[PDB]
Design a protein around this ligand. Structure first.
Ligand SMILES: Cn1ncc(C(=O)N2CCC2)c1C(=O)Nc1cc2nc(N3CCOCC3)nn2cn1
Ligand SMILES: [Mg+2]
Ligand SMILES: [Zn+2]
Length: 313
């Protein structure tokens, strides 16, 4: 009851910044997450024994793939922590509870392949869930773990608070399908510029939480350049394995996925910063001004990718 999780001084300070890197010591990641739930949510949000049990079952259900792994889950939860701490009074008690859990769970049991590859392989999951295939699977894995004996971290919420939090989590996880992001951001753009955006409108809140999920999920592009560049290697290690598997099915992969098109990586990063990341953090910053450091970090990494193309590294 009287037990604070605490971190060493450098972590205690740096964890509050958007660009924080959770580091290479795997055994400290659960303690980093609990630290963030206690400061974001309070030391009473969850029964500590249940939370610990939930975190370790979540970890066990992430696979040892190069990018979509336990380290990504915790990185995406830290970015959400940073957003929640810098916009304290905009979010309900249930959103603060739900969203950090959503982020920890958002890629549960990912195999390292896109929804596209599951559909071309004819994976069973592609018949169960015709769109947002992996994302419906991640939410399903989340509900499975919540129903393990001793794992229901939400057990002491009213019947209707429980339903609301699982609905926050479902939408937050579905919104990490980047196919859904483009139209969601366009609507958020229009609603903010015509001045119709209304955080009391539940469907507006939904849209804004969806963008927050895209922003946290992409947060590798908002780090110190060395973190950004090394993370890009893990990302392409998956994409090129997917390309290899497309070729085994007798299909030319898109260029993104073709390891023969390594030379073009810098230009593909430019595409990605301009089509996805920059517009994401731009709209996020207009809606939630204290998230500007994500936009600023993204723009700095774009200009690092421009330097790579100009031979200056
Ligand atoms: C940095 N980051 N964080 C997230 C993602 C991302 O997409 N998701 C989906 C799972 C995570 C990317 C990311 O690299 N995206 C990305 C890279 C890329 N390279 C190319 N190529 C290169 C070869 O030459 C042709 C163009 N197209 N292209 C399009 N998008
Ligand atoms: Mg995902
Ligand atoms: Zn993800």
């Amino acid at each position: 009851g009287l037990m604070q999780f605490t971190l060493p001084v450098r972590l205690c300070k740096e964890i509050e910044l958007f660009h924080f890197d959770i580091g290479p010591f795997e055994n400290m990641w659960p303690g980093i997450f609990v630290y963030m739930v206690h400061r974001s949510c309070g030391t009473s949000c969850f029964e500590l024994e249940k939370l610990c049990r939930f975190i370790m079952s979540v970890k066990k259900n992430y696979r040892r793939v190069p990018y979509h792994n336990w380290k990504h889950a915790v990185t995406v939860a830290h970015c959400m922590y940073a957003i929640l701490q810098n916009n304290h009074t905009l979010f309900t008690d249930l959103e603060r509870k739900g969203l950090l859990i959503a982020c920890l769970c958002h890629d549960l049991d990912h195999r390292g392949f896109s929804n596209s590859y599951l559909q071309k392989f004819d994976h069973p999951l592609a018949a169960l869930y015709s769109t947002s295939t992996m994302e419906q699977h991640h939410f399903s894995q989340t509900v499975s773990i919540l129903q393990l004996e001793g794992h229901n971290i939400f057990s002491t919420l009213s019947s209707s608070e429980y339903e609301q939090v699982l609905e926050i989590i479902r939408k937050a996880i579905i919104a990490t399908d980047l196919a859904l992001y483009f139209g969601n951001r366009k609507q958020l753009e229009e609603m903010y510029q015509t001045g119709s955006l209304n955080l009391n409108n539940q469907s507006h809140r939904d849209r804004v939480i969806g963008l927050m999920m895209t922003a946290c999920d992409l947060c590798s592009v908002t780090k110190l350049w060395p973190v950004t560049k090394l993370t890009a290697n893990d990302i392409y290690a998956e994409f090129w394995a997917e390309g290899d598997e497309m070729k085994k099915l007798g299909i030319q992969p898109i260029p993104m996925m073709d390891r023969d098109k390594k030379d073009e990586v810098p230009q593909g990063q430019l595409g990605f910063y301009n089509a996805v990341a920059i517009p994401c953090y731009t709209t996020l910053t207009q809606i939630l001004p204290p998230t500007e450091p994500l936009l600023k970090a993204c723009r700095d990494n774009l200009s690092q990718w421009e330097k790579v193309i100009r031979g200056e590294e």
